[PDB]
Short mmCIF file of N, CA, C and O in Angstrom, two decimals:
data_model
loop_
_atom_site.label_atom_id
_atom_site.label_comp_id
_atom_site.label_asym_id
_atom_site.label_seq_id
_atom_site.Cartn_x
_atom_site.Cartn_y
_atom_site.Cartn_z
N UNK A 1 3.69 -4.29 29.37
CA UNK A 1 4.60 -3.20 29.05
C UNK A 1 5.47 -3.55 27.85
O UNK A 1 6.23 -4.52 27.87
N UNK A 2 5.36 -2.75 26.79
CA UNK A 2 6.13 -2.98 25.57
C UNK A 2 6.10 -1.75 24.67
O UNK A 2 5.15 -0.98 24.68
N UNK A 3 7.17 -1.57 23.89
CA UNK A 3 7.26 -0.43 22.99
C UNK A 3 8.50 -0.55 22.09
O UNK A 3 9.62 -0.62 22.58
N UNK A 4 8.27 -0.57 20.79
CA UNK A 4 9.37 -0.68 19.83
C UNK A 4 9.06 0.12 18.56
O UNK A 4 8.01 0.74 18.44
N UNK A 5 9.99 0.09 17.61
CA UNK A 5 9.80 0.81 16.36
C UNK A 5 11.06 0.85 15.52
O UNK A 5 12.16 0.63 16.03
N UNK A 6 10.90 1.12 14.23
CA UNK A 6 12.04 1.19 13.34
C UNK A 6 12.00 2.40 12.43
O UNK A 6 11.15 3.27 12.59
N UNK A 7 12.93 2.45 11.47
CA UNK A 7 13.00 3.57 10.54
C UNK A 7 12.47 3.16 9.17
O UNK A 7 12.38 1.98 8.83
N UNK A 8 12.10 4.17 8.36
CA UNK A 8 11.57 3.94 7.01
C UNK A 8 12.63 3.42 6.05
O UNK A 8 13.83 3.54 6.31
N UNK A 9 12.19 2.84 4.94
CA UNK A 9 13.10 2.30 3.94
C UNK A 9 12.33 1.77 2.73
O UNK A 9 12.43 0.59 2.39
N UNK A 10 11.57 2.65 2.09
CA UNK A 10 10.79 2.27 0.92
C UNK A 10 11.68 2.18 -0.32
O UNK A 10 12.89 2.35 -0.24
N UNK A 11 11.06 1.91 -1.46
CA UNK A 11 11.79 1.79 -2.72
C UNK A 11 12.84 0.69 -2.64
O UNK A 11 14.04 0.96 -2.65
N UNK A 12 12.38 -0.56 -2.55
CA UNK A 12 13.30 -1.68 -2.47
C UNK A 12 14.10 -1.87 -3.74
O UNK A 12 15.25 -1.46 -3.83
N UNK A 13 13.48 -2.51 -4.74
CA UNK A 13 14.16 -2.75 -6.00
C UNK A 13 13.40 -3.70 -6.89
O UNK A 13 13.83 -4.83 -7.11
N UNK A 14 12.26 -3.26 -7.41
CA UNK A 14 11.44 -4.09 -8.28
C UNK A 14 12.17 -4.41 -9.57
O UNK A 14 13.31 -3.99 -9.77
N UNK A 15 11.52 -5.16 -10.45
CA UNK A 15 12.12 -5.53 -11.72
C UNK A 15 11.13 -5.55 -12.86
O UNK A 15 10.93 -4.54 -13.54
N UNK A 16 10.49 -6.70 -13.07
CA UNK A 16 9.51 -6.84 -14.13
C UNK A 16 10.12 -6.53 -15.49
O UNK A 16 9.89 -5.46 -16.05
N UNK A 17 10.90 -7.47 -16.01
CA UNK A 17 11.55 -7.29 -17.31
C UNK A 17 12.09 -8.61 -17.83
O UNK A 17 13.20 -9.03 -17.48
N UNK A 18 11.31 -9.28 -18.68
CA UNK A 18 11.73 -10.55 -19.24
C UNK A 18 10.69 -11.15 -20.16
O UNK A 18 9.49 -10.91 -20.00
N UNK A 19 11.14 -11.92 -21.15
CA UNK A 19 10.24 -12.55 -22.11
C UNK A 19 9.56 -13.77 -21.50
O UNK A 19 9.73 -14.06 -20.32
N UNK A 20 8.79 -14.47 -22.32
CA UNK A 20 8.08 -15.67 -21.86
C UNK A 20 7.89 -16.65 -23.01
O UNK A 20 7.09 -16.41 -23.92
N UNK A 21 8.62 -17.76 -22.96
CA UNK A 21 8.53 -18.78 -24.00
C UNK A 21 8.05 -20.11 -23.41
O UNK A 21 6.90 -20.50 -23.61
N UNK A 22 8.94 -20.79 -22.69
CA UNK A 22 8.60 -22.06 -22.08
C UNK A 22 9.78 -22.60 -21.26
O UNK A 22 9.73 -22.64 -20.03
N UNK A 23 10.83 -23.01 -21.96
CA UNK A 23 12.02 -23.54 -21.30
C UNK A 23 11.69 -24.82 -20.54
O UNK A 23 10.53 -25.12 -20.28
N UNK A 24 12.73 -25.58 -20.19
CA UNK A 24 12.55 -26.83 -19.47
C UNK A 24 13.64 -27.02 -18.42
O UNK A 24 14.81 -27.23 -18.75
N UNK A 25 13.26 -26.93 -17.15
CA UNK A 25 14.20 -27.09 -16.05
C UNK A 25 13.47 -27.24 -14.72
O UNK A 25 12.31 -26.86 -14.59
N UNK A 26 14.17 -27.79 -13.73
CA UNK A 26 13.59 -27.99 -12.41
C UNK A 26 14.56 -27.55 -11.31
O UNK A 26 15.67 -28.06 -11.22
N UNK A 27 14.13 -26.60 -10.49
CA UNK A 27 14.95 -26.09 -9.41
C UNK A 27 14.15 -25.95 -8.12
O UNK A 27 13.04 -25.42 -8.13
N UNK A 28 14.72 -26.43 -7.02
CA UNK A 28 14.06 -26.35 -5.72
C UNK A 28 14.45 -25.08 -4.98
O UNK A 28 15.62 -24.70 -4.95
N UNK A 29 13.46 -24.43 -4.37
CA UNK A 29 13.70 -23.20 -3.62
C UNK A 29 13.23 -23.34 -2.17
O UNK A 29 12.21 -23.96 -1.90
N UNK A 30 13.99 -22.75 -1.25
CA UNK A 30 13.65 -22.81 0.16
C UNK A 30 13.71 -21.41 0.79
O UNK A 30 14.78 -20.82 0.90
N UNK A 31 12.55 -20.90 1.19
CA UNK A 31 12.46 -19.58 1.80
C UNK A 31 12.44 -19.69 3.32
O UNK A 31 11.56 -20.32 3.90
N UNK A 32 13.42 -19.06 3.96
CA UNK A 32 13.52 -19.07 5.42
C UNK A 32 13.27 -17.69 6.00
O UNK A 32 13.37 -16.68 5.30
N UNK A 33 12.96 -17.64 7.29
CA UNK A 33 12.70 -16.38 7.97
C UNK A 33 13.44 -16.32 9.31
O UNK A 33 13.71 -17.35 9.92
N UNK A 34 13.75 -15.10 9.75
CA UNK A 34 14.46 -14.91 11.01
C UNK A 34 13.63 -15.43 12.18
O UNK A 34 14.18 -15.76 13.24
N UNK A 35 12.32 -15.52 11.99
CA UNK A 35 11.43 -16.00 13.03
C UNK A 35 11.42 -17.53 13.07
O UNK A 35 11.12 -18.13 14.10
N UNK A 36 11.74 -18.15 11.94
CA UNK A 36 11.76 -19.59 11.86
C UNK A 36 10.90 -20.13 10.74
O UNK A 36 11.26 -21.11 10.08
N UNK A 37 9.76 -19.49 10.51
CA UNK A 37 8.84 -19.90 9.46
C UNK A 37 9.56 -20.04 8.12
O UNK A 37 10.15 -19.08 7.63
N UNK A 38 9.52 -21.24 7.55
CA UNK A 38 10.17 -21.50 6.27
C UNK A 38 9.40 -22.55 5.47
O UNK A 38 8.62 -23.32 6.03
N UNK A 39 9.63 -22.58 4.17
CA UNK A 39 8.96 -23.53 3.29
C UNK A 39 9.77 -23.75 2.01
O UNK A 39 10.29 -22.80 1.42
N UNK A 40 9.86 -25.00 1.58
CA UNK A 40 10.60 -25.35 0.37
C UNK A 40 9.72 -26.12 -0.60
O UNK A 40 8.84 -26.87 -0.20
N UNK A 41 9.96 -25.92 -1.89
CA UNK A 41 9.19 -26.59 -2.93
C UNK A 41 9.95 -26.61 -4.25
O UNK A 41 10.79 -25.74 -4.51
N UNK A 42 9.66 -27.60 -5.09
CA UNK A 42 10.32 -27.73 -6.38
C UNK A 42 9.50 -27.05 -7.48
O UNK A 42 8.33 -27.39 -7.69
N UNK A 43 10.12 -26.10 -8.17
CA UNK A 43 9.45 -25.38 -9.24
C UNK A 43 10.40 -25.12 -10.40
O UNK A 43 11.62 -25.02 -10.22
N UNK A 44 9.85 -25.00 -11.60
CA UNK A 44 10.64 -24.75 -12.80
C UNK A 44 11.51 -23.50 -12.62
O UNK A 44 11.03 -22.46 -12.17
N UNK A 45 12.78 -23.62 -12.98
CA UNK A 45 13.71 -22.50 -12.86
C UNK A 45 13.15 -21.25 -13.52
O UNK A 45 13.40 -20.13 -13.07
N UNK A 46 12.38 -21.44 -14.58
CA UNK A 46 11.78 -20.33 -15.31
C UNK A 46 11.04 -19.40 -14.35
O UNK A 46 11.19 -18.18 -14.42
N UNK A 47 10.23 -19.98 -13.47
CA UNK A 47 9.47 -19.20 -12.50
C UNK A 47 9.42 -19.90 -11.15
O UNK A 47 8.61 -20.81 -10.93
N UNK A 48 10.29 -19.47 -10.24
CA UNK A 48 10.34 -20.05 -8.90
C UNK A 48 10.24 -18.98 -7.83
O UNK A 48 9.40 -19.05 -6.94
N UNK A 49 11.12 -17.98 -7.92
CA UNK A 49 11.13 -16.88 -6.95
C UNK A 49 9.86 -16.05 -7.06
O UNK A 49 9.39 -15.48 -6.07
N UNK A 50 9.30 -15.98 -8.26
CA UNK A 50 8.08 -15.22 -8.50
C UNK A 50 6.91 -15.82 -7.72
O UNK A 50 6.21 -15.11 -6.99
N UNK A 51 6.70 -17.12 -7.87
CA UNK A 51 5.62 -17.81 -7.18
C UNK A 51 5.92 -17.95 -5.69
O UNK A 51 5.01 -17.99 -4.86
N UNK A 52 7.21 -18.01 -5.36
CA UNK A 52 7.63 -18.13 -3.97
C UNK A 52 7.26 -16.89 -3.17
O UNK A 52 6.62 -16.97 -2.12
N UNK A 53 7.68 -15.73 -3.67
CA UNK A 53 7.39 -14.46 -3.01
C UNK A 53 5.92 -14.09 -3.15
O UNK A 53 5.33 -13.48 -2.25
N UNK A 54 5.32 -14.46 -4.27
CA UNK A 54 3.92 -14.17 -4.53
C UNK A 54 3.01 -15.02 -3.64
O UNK A 54 2.02 -14.53 -3.10
N UNK A 55 3.37 -16.29 -3.48
CA UNK A 55 2.59 -17.20 -2.65
C UNK A 55 2.79 -16.91 -1.17
O UNK A 55 1.85 -16.99 -0.38
N UNK A 56 4.02 -16.57 -0.80
CA UNK A 56 4.35 -16.27 0.58
C UNK A 56 3.68 -14.97 1.03
O UNK A 56 3.14 -14.89 2.13
N UNK A 57 3.73 -13.96 0.17
CA UNK A 57 3.13 -12.67 0.47
C UNK A 57 1.61 -12.76 0.48
O UNK A 57 0.95 -12.28 1.40
N UNK A 58 1.05 -13.39 -0.55
CA UNK A 58 -0.39 -13.55 -0.66
C UNK A 58 -0.94 -14.37 0.50
O UNK A 58 -1.98 -14.04 1.07
N UNK A 59 -0.24 -15.44 0.84
CA UNK A 59 -0.66 -16.31 1.94
C UNK A 59 -0.59 -15.57 3.27
O UNK A 59 -1.52 -15.63 4.07
N UNK A 60 0.52 -14.88 3.50
CA UNK A 60 0.71 -14.13 4.74
C UNK A 60 -0.33 -13.03 4.88
O UNK A 60 -0.58 -12.53 5.97
N UNK A 61 -0.95 -12.66 3.76
CA UNK A 61 -1.96 -11.62 3.78
C UNK A 61 -1.37 -10.23 3.68
O UNK A 61 -1.97 -9.26 4.16
N UNK A 62 -0.19 -10.13 3.08
CA UNK A 62 0.48 -8.85 2.92
C UNK A 62 1.07 -8.70 1.53
O UNK A 62 1.68 -9.63 1.00
N UNK A 63 0.90 -7.52 0.94
CA UNK A 63 1.41 -7.25 -0.40
C UNK A 63 2.93 -7.44 -0.44
O UNK A 63 3.57 -7.64 0.59
N UNK A 64 3.49 -7.38 -1.65
CA UNK A 64 4.93 -7.54 -1.83
C UNK A 64 5.66 -6.21 -1.64
O UNK A 64 6.45 -5.80 -2.49
N UNK A 65 5.38 -5.55 -0.53
CA UNK A 65 6.01 -4.26 -0.23
C UNK A 65 6.43 -4.19 1.24
O UNK A 65 6.16 -3.20 1.92
N UNK A 66 7.09 -5.24 1.71
CA UNK A 66 7.54 -5.29 3.10
C UNK A 66 8.28 -6.59 3.38
O UNK A 66 8.19 -7.16 4.47
N UNK A 67 9.02 -7.07 2.38
CA UNK A 67 9.79 -8.30 2.51
C UNK A 67 11.00 -8.31 1.59
O UNK A 67 10.86 -8.21 0.37
N UNK A 68 12.18 -8.41 2.18
CA UNK A 68 13.42 -8.42 1.41
C UNK A 68 13.88 -9.86 1.14
O UNK A 68 14.29 -10.57 2.05
N UNK A 69 13.80 -10.27 -0.12
CA UNK A 69 14.21 -11.61 -0.51
C UNK A 69 15.63 -11.61 -1.06
O UNK A 69 15.88 -11.18 -2.19
N UNK A 70 16.57 -12.10 -0.25
CA UNK A 70 17.97 -12.16 -0.65
C UNK A 70 18.45 -13.60 -0.73
O UNK A 70 17.93 -14.48 -0.04
N UNK A 71 19.45 -13.85 -1.57
CA UNK A 71 20.01 -15.18 -1.74
C UNK A 71 21.52 -15.17 -1.57
O UNK A 71 22.25 -14.71 -2.44
N UNK A 72 21.99 -15.67 -0.43
CA UNK A 72 23.42 -15.71 -0.14
C UNK A 72 24.04 -14.32 -0.25
O UNK A 72 25.20 -14.18 -0.62
N UNK A 73 23.25 -13.30 0.07
CA UNK A 73 23.74 -11.94 0.00
C UNK A 73 23.29 -11.22 -1.26
O UNK A 73 23.75 -10.12 -1.56
N UNK A 74 22.38 -11.85 -2.00
CA UNK A 74 21.87 -11.27 -3.24
C UNK A 74 20.42 -10.84 -3.08
O UNK A 74 19.48 -11.56 -3.43
N UNK A 75 20.22 -9.63 -2.54
CA UNK A 75 18.88 -9.07 -2.32
C UNK A 75 18.19 -8.70 -3.63
O UNK A 75 18.40 -7.62 -4.18
N UNK A 76 17.36 -9.62 -4.12
CA UNK A 76 16.63 -9.39 -5.37
C UNK A 76 15.27 -10.08 -5.34
O UNK A 76 15.10 -11.11 -4.68
N UNK A 77 14.31 -9.52 -6.07
CA UNK A 77 12.97 -10.09 -6.14
C UNK A 77 12.60 -10.44 -7.57
O UNK A 77 12.03 -9.62 -8.30
N UNK A 78 12.92 -11.66 -7.98
CA UNK A 78 12.62 -12.12 -9.33
C UNK A 78 13.07 -13.56 -9.53
O UNK A 78 13.85 -14.09 -8.74
N UNK A 79 12.58 -14.19 -10.60
CA UNK A 79 12.94 -15.57 -10.90
C UNK A 79 13.94 -15.64 -12.05
O UNK A 79 14.13 -16.69 -12.66
N UNK A 80 14.57 -14.51 -12.34
CA UNK A 80 15.56 -14.44 -13.42
C UNK A 80 16.95 -14.14 -12.87
O UNK A 80 17.94 -14.73 -13.30
N UNK A 81 17.01 -13.23 -11.90
CA UNK A 81 18.28 -12.85 -11.29
C UNK A 81 18.92 -14.04 -10.58
O UNK A 81 20.02 -14.48 -10.92
N UNK A 82 18.22 -14.59 -9.58
CA UNK A 82 18.70 -15.73 -8.80
C UNK A 82 18.71 -17.02 -9.62
O UNK A 82 19.40 -17.98 -9.27
N UNK A 83 17.95 -17.03 -10.71
CA UNK A 83 17.87 -18.20 -11.58
C UNK A 83 19.14 -18.34 -12.42
O UNK A 83 19.77 -19.39 -12.44
N UNK A 84 19.50 -17.26 -13.11
CA UNK A 84 20.69 -17.26 -13.96
C UNK A 84 21.95 -17.15 -13.11
O UNK A 84 23.03 -17.56 -13.53
N UNK A 85 21.82 -16.57 -11.92
CA UNK A 85 22.95 -16.40 -11.02
C UNK A 85 23.22 -17.68 -10.24
O UNK A 85 24.37 -18.00 -9.94
N UNK A 86 22.16 -18.41 -9.92
CA UNK A 86 22.31 -19.65 -9.18
C UNK A 86 22.49 -20.85 -10.09
O UNK A 86 23.50 -21.55 -10.03
N UNK A 87 21.49 -21.10 -10.94
CA UNK A 87 21.54 -22.22 -11.87
C UNK A 87 21.56 -23.55 -11.11
O UNK A 87 22.04 -24.56 -11.63
N UNK A 88 21.04 -23.53 -9.89
CA UNK A 88 21.00 -24.74 -9.06
C UNK A 88 19.60 -24.97 -8.50
O UNK A 88 18.80 -24.04 -8.41
N UNK A 89 19.32 -26.21 -8.13
CA UNK A 89 18.02 -26.57 -7.57
C UNK A 89 18.00 -26.35 -6.06
O UNK A 89 17.08 -26.80 -5.38
N UNK A 90 19.01 -25.67 -5.55
CA UNK A 90 19.11 -25.40 -4.12
C UNK A 90 19.09 -23.89 -3.85
O UNK A 90 19.86 -23.39 -3.03
N UNK A 91 18.21 -23.18 -4.55
CA UNK A 91 18.09 -21.74 -4.38
C UNK A 91 17.42 -21.40 -3.06
O UNK A 91 16.27 -21.76 -2.82
N UNK A 92 18.15 -20.69 -2.20
CA UNK A 92 17.62 -20.30 -0.90
C UNK A 92 17.33 -18.80 -0.85
O UNK A 92 18.04 -18.00 -1.47
N UNK A 93 16.29 -18.43 -0.11
CA UNK A 93 15.91 -17.03 0.01
C UNK A 93 15.57 -16.68 1.46
O UNK A 93 14.60 -17.18 2.02
N UNK A 94 16.39 -15.81 2.06
CA UNK A 94 16.18 -15.39 3.44
C UNK A 94 15.38 -14.09 3.49
O UNK A 94 15.91 -13.02 3.20
N UNK A 95 14.11 -14.20 3.87
CA UNK A 95 13.25 -13.03 3.97
C UNK A 95 13.57 -12.20 5.21
O UNK A 95 13.44 -12.68 6.33
N UNK A 96 14.00 -10.96 4.99
CA UNK A 96 14.35 -10.07 6.09
C UNK A 96 13.45 -8.84 6.10
O UNK A 96 12.92 -8.44 5.06
N UNK A 97 13.27 -8.25 7.28
CA UNK A 97 12.44 -7.06 7.42
C UNK A 97 13.29 -5.81 7.61
O UNK A 97 14.20 -5.78 8.44
N UNK A 98 12.98 -4.77 6.83
CA UNK A 98 13.72 -3.52 6.91
C UNK A 98 12.77 -2.32 6.87
O UNK A 98 13.15 -1.24 6.44
N UNK A 99 11.54 -2.54 7.31
CA UNK A 99 10.53 -1.48 7.32
C UNK A 99 9.27 -1.94 8.04
O UNK A 99 8.88 -3.11 7.96
N UNK A 100 8.62 -1.02 8.74
CA UNK A 100 7.40 -1.32 9.47
C UNK A 100 6.19 -0.65 8.83
O UNK A 100 6.20 0.56 8.58
N UNK A 101 5.15 -1.43 8.57
CA UNK A 101 3.94 -0.89 7.97
C UNK A 101 2.68 -1.39 8.64
O UNK A 101 2.00 -0.64 9.34
N UNK A 102 2.36 -2.66 8.43
CA UNK A 102 1.17 -3.24 9.03
C UNK A 102 1.35 -3.53 10.50
O UNK A 102 2.45 -3.43 11.04
#
């Protein structure tokens, strides 16, 4: 016996807006989940959140349209927002769910 459900909430907040040169920096990121599943890795500040959400979503077997990546209250999906806002190798991202699809 079981039965649950939630409300809709599409149109999160994409980005896709930035140049590409090279840069030199190292920042560690740790993605946690309300369920417990978490993973941390060291990646260039230039591109960390991108590969983090891309690898987490791709690995989980679900597109990037059902996961809210926030940092200390900063709900954003990109390696530029949290990068320039954090500027630290301790960038954390708490993946939260606010919509049901799969």
